[PDB]
Amino acid sequence: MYDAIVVGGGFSGLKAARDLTNAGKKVLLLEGGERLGGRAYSRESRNVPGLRVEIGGAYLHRKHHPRLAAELDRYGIPTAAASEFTSFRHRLGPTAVDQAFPIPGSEAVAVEAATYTLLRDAHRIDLEKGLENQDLEDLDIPLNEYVDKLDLPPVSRQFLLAWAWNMLGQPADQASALWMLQLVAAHHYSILGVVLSLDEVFSNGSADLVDAMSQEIPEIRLQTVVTGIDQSGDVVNVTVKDGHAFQAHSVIVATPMNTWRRIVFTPALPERRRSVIEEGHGGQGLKILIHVRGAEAGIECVGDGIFPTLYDYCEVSESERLLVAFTDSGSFDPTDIGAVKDAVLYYLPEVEVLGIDYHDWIADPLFEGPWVAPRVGQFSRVHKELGEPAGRIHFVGSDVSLEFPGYIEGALETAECAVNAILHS
Template identity: 75%
Template structure:
């Protein structure tokens, strides 16, 4: 059977694309390679605390920063709750650190103010619509550690900045790009605090509640169909899955994660420079751990120079037990090593008992091959916006190629919106030419 459009990938970008095109009257097929929908938004029962639903992937939202996601929540009546408030602070940032929300001591206020000015000045150089390769930003696309060292910050301020950067980029400062850290600042209304304060709300009943609601509005869906090739050398595009099943359409939307595109054979071949970045894949190795502990204070928040740059409260399990969420990267830490987890937690909270850990290794998952997007140094100043632009009748969507909100559900929805508009415009032009 031939379709108007085939969508490859059932995360939020794929679901929105398929739903909106079908709602506009198109005959649409959604192909998902796995056995569940939602992509890197993944809620399920905790492996350490039965009957407790947890978010293994993306979880946080802010209605001001994420208007498209807010609109989807309102459309389906999906409930959210306020994220845990931090009220107890146990930082490890040096002898002059203060265990309060903003731990910078007064003696470092002036150099920190100067550094913030530089960060905001450089972030304001970024136009979120033009792409990082089109703005002469190569001087900022350097290892983050070099950029931070040049700021001349004292000990506490420097450690504080590096800890949150590691949390957000999913790469240690030696490997992450200063330009990408600044891109995240630009995306949050050019606000350093906006990046942190975007952790505002969470899904009350898990992100899969929204996933399932959107799925009900997608007329045709096939699970377990891993796409291996997309051939648009003829009038009708041929999409072939891993079992050799061939599907035909007039347009295709690739909504799979960027790091899996190299597993798809495109005919004609993608342009060389674009293909080279796709073959490299982005360098994000972010690791989110949900650590089950006993004896932790409610509202705990830790920032520091440990192997977990951040460790903070996630939710209550019982009167004496809680889940904490830690961020690090899979190249620096082995989450299978319970002893290492205990050491990392005890660096901040020596009094708690570690009962278990829950996580998903996105880098090792063949359907994702990486967590949220974080480019290699020098990569996106070479090729950024073009990664998400159409290649003839094949469109590319997903949070990995969002310009305004990369790595967020909002970014996935933003790119889907763009692709739907382009495909519907093309359909009108085709109809008028006949």
């Protein structure tokens, strides 16, 4: 029996388990799958033999993500610039300019005004308090409605919505304005920052850091799926699918929010949390790697397409590349290759689609979602409390970060807090 059991071996679980270990605690890490890293998942390309790709999250920015930066520096993990954008192929109408910031002068005054409004609203958010605790209900409405009130002209309107579709992984009518504003706040109150944070990637894949961290964790069980967490007794009992139980003074739940509903908690989690946990968050982000021929290097496309964004990912050969598209799984079916072709050709009529690669995070029973994004109305009801302890059970992960939700940095941040909580218990 253990000082702490950590459930889930994503970056959150990994940090917590490592850090508690180095604090001299006796720790066990239980991972349901056959790998560590969770929604950070580097692996071989399905389309291009020998080519490593990121099929989950990977993009980082050292300045927005200091914990991550610290980890990289700690283990000497090399990073590289994200693919540069040099050729612009937007679908934003005839008045758009083909650069990274495609807003024409005729829209400048509109954009000035909207910048003030957006930032004013974002500045309503204290990142420490929780989105439920700040009288922010009026902002927790469908993004399309919020944006309609901004009355933006066509280029800026669609540019904003496209990036929002990318970043939230929800269509505009499902996304919450408040959450959009949360992301703005998270990036030191910057709209620009949200997209500029696509700055660097792992030179050798995210697995590089995963492996470095795991090497400092002495006891790990893979293929071990937690089904119950019971703290009715003096010591927490953790039940497992096909397995003897394990026991600890403290348990850290570092599994994805949308999977908590599959664990039996005893006693039941506090009532305020229960509805959101049952329903799950609304994240439907879909990241598709597209093997192509006939694409020049350095392409970026933003527009009104079913792929809001489509852009350069990596060189494969002189003639071939990977692009990456973002959309959502509600709106798009990646098993329909005809649909993929149409989506690509809309932006890039000269380009041949050779194949695609993605992971269906939503269908994955260890995840039941990509990155976090609330349904409208969820997080102005309950948010901070999702990441707060219930007795000896802690809750960590990107999904519950107040500071950087939906990012690796939020995984690290939340772990820190739990580790500290436990050490001072």
